[PDB]
Amino acid sequence: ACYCRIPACIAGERRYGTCIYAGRLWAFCC
Amino acid sequence: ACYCRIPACIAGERRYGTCIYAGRLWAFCC
Amino acid sequence: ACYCRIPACIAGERRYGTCIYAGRLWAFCC
Amino acid sequence: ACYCRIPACIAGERRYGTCIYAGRLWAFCC
Ligand SMILES: [Cl-]
Ligand SMILES: [Cl-]
Ligand SMILES: [Cl-]
Ligand SMILES: [Cl-]
Ligand SMILES: [Cl-]
């Protein structure tokens, strides 16, 4: 499953991009 | 147990203040 | 001229979009 | 005169701390 996370993905995930949500920038992680 | 959340606390929680974590500001929620 | 500004454009400018710069989200103002 | 800047102070300035302004964190520079 994919999630938006700050500041980085958790171990086992890969960052595919970035999310813009609630006026902040997140890692897009799957 | 408290948490840092963006942009707001969840139901069940009261906001006590703000967190500064990973270069972002978060609601500090318990 | 166009600028990235937080949290909003200044009087006389119009927001055309958003900038991603230095891990924050800005108004794109011209 | 001090200023709030993202992501860092400019030349001529010393960072004294951090600003919390408009939901973002800034370098506090004089
Ligand atoms: Cl991998
Ligand atoms: Cl931010
Ligand atoms: Cl917040
Ligand atoms: Cl206009
Ligand atoms: Cl900073």
Q: Are A30 and A18 in contact (CB under 8 A)?
A: no
User: In the structure encoding, which two tokens stand for residue B12, read together?
Assistant: 């069940």
Window 6-25 of C: residues touching D by CB (8 A cutoff) are 6-7, 21-24
Nearest CA in chain B to A8: B22
Element holding C10 (H helix, E strand): none
Say yes or no for a CB contact (<8 Å) between B20 and D25: yes
Q: Are A4 and A21 in contact (CB under 8 A)?
A: yes
CA-nearest of B10, B1, B6 to B21 is B6
Rounded to 10 degrees, what is the CA torsion of C19, C23, C24, C30?
-20
Q: How far is CA B26 from the centre of its chain?
A: 5
- List CB contacts (< 8 A) between B7 and chain A: 22-23
Determination approach: X-ray
